[PDB]
Design a protein around this ligand. Structure first.
Ligand code: NI
Length: 482
């Protein structure tokens, strides 16, 4: 009756979040399929050297949030007044960690894509009738659902096809973010999945926040019905989009705008006409072209037009390259205000495009200041040849297709998780030893950056450069001290 988990090293959700410049973390959960009752003591044994974290409870599934646990190697006795599902968090980057649940707890359906069969699923449901929850785990996704809700909306013999679709969507949004499984540094999507939670304790419709996206009662059809997710899945696409938004070009007014760049990505990828096109949002937005107050007048879907136009105009690679370029910014060049984010966006997009985009932004009433004009002027980029502010999906206006940014490769070095005096931004020698297996032509620059300077043992970013002059930041764990 001992249940053993081989917890892979996943790294830190907060780490990833900061490296990505995203507003909220991905899920830290590795599910166990073990429900633990209120006040039930669970005996769990951690083998090997490394310590890990654990949770009793599921974010957004109960009224009260999950209780959290630090597991020292050897024997532990954890317990929650509220009970809940058990999850493990091997937040380290190196070393698999074996955790054994010796006593306490009871089985709860957990279906893992690529591990379980239709037979296992059927058996699972029959053996654990009317359980606390249903959990379904894909490569990139986790679903924590009420059982009556799965029984109503799952239209397949097993959850496999559904998980594959959810993973497909998540990967599309990762891709749009210039983030991949293999990529190093600013291209690394990280090892954490996206969590979808049926939340019976909110009046909100759907929402996204740290660790998970959640869906209030009666609103789960497009998360659980494969055809609805595929064909009419805006809600979940959008909430996943929120977890993807990067704050560095998220000024006031864009919170409910840029999220839908990801949604439109999924929507067009699945072969559907854009919500923009269906809602006549283009013609509605064009009524403001050349009007100076356009940004104050346009609604959130109107403003979405401009952003999507750049996608149509340059490549599927536009937003992938834009995301990465923003992640390469040094501390002093991170935009500190709404106005700065705006001036920065005009500059950064022009560089990704390799064209002076000012006339385009001018049309949308996003005015470059003279500093931004001159700064783009010094780039000697060709002018816009077409009128891309008039672009629609049905009549797209395309400039040159741009290729994907090739980020230089490099790795951390955990040999010696090392010492650093806080606020160091350049150490030629230390930098060379924080990284390893760099690529060809590639070398450290000496630049070192800590996004939120805290003390002790946190991820710092080590800058690298290749023969071309393309940069990357490699995250590594360090001791930061006085
Ligand atoms: Ni939203």
């Amino acid at each position: 009756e001992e249940r053993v988990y081989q917890l892979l090293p996943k790294g830190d959700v907060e780490g990833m979040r900061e490296l990505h410049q995203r507003g909220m973390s991905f899920s830290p959960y590795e599910p166990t399929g073990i429900y633990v009752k209120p006040d039930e003591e669970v005996v769990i044994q951690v083998e090997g050297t490394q310590q890990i974290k654990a949770y009793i409870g599921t974010y957004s599934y109960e009224k009260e949030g999950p209780k959290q646990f630090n597991l020292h190697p050897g024997e532990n006795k954890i317990s929650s007044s509220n009970g809940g599902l058990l999850y493990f968090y091997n937040y380290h980057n190196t070393g698999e960690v074996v955790a054994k649940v010796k006593k306490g707890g009871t089985p709860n359906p957990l279906f893992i894509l690529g591990k379980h069969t239709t037979k296992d699923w059927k058996r699972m449901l029959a053996e654990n009738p009317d359980p606390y929850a249903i959990e379904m785990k894909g490569e990139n996704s986790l679903l924590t659902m009420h059982p009556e809700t799965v029984a109503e909306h799952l239209k397949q013999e097993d959850p496999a096809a559904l998980l594959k679709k959810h993973d497909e969507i998540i990967n599309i949004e990762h891709k749009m973010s210039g983030l991949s499984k293999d990529g190093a540094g600013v291209a690394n999507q990280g090892k954490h999945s996206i969590h979808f939670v049926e939340d019976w304790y909110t009046d909100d419709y759907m929402y996204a926040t740290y660790y998970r996206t959640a869906y209030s009662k009666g609103n789960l059809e497009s998360v659980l019905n494969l055809e609805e997710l595929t064909n009419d899945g805006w809600g979940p696409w959008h909430e996943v989009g929120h977890q993807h938004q990067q704050d560095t070009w998220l000024w006031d007014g864009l919170g409910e705008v840029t999220v839908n760049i990801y949604s439109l990505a999924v929507q067009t990828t699945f072969g559907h006409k854009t919500r923009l096109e269906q809602e006549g949002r283009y013609e509605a937005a064009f009524a403001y072209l050349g009007k100076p107050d356009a940004q104050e007048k346009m609604n959130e879907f109107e403003k979405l037009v401009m952003f999507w136009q750049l996608h149509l105009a340059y490549g599927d690679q536009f937003y992938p390259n834009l995301h990465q370029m923003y992640r390469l910014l040094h501390d002093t060049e991170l935009p500190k205000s709404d106005e700065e984010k705006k001036q920065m966006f005009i500059y950064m997009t022009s560089k990704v495009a390799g064209q002076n985009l000012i006339p385009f932004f001018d049309k949308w009433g996003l005015s470059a200041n003279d500093a931004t004009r001159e700064k783009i002027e010094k780039l000697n980029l060709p002018k816009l040849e077409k009128e891309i502010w008039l672009s629609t999906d049905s009549n797209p206006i395309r400039e040159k297709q741009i290729e994907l940014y090739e980020a230089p490769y490099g790795e951390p070095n955990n040999e010696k998780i090392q010492n650093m005096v806080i606020g160091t931004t350049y150490d030629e020698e230390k930098a060379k030893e924080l990284v390893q297996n760099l690529g060809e032509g590639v070398k450290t620059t000496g630049v070192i950056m800590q996004d939120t300077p805290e003390v002790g043992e946190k991820t710092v970013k080590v800058e690298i450069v290749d023969g071309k002059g393309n940069k990357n930041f490699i995250p590594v764990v360090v001791n930061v001290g006085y």
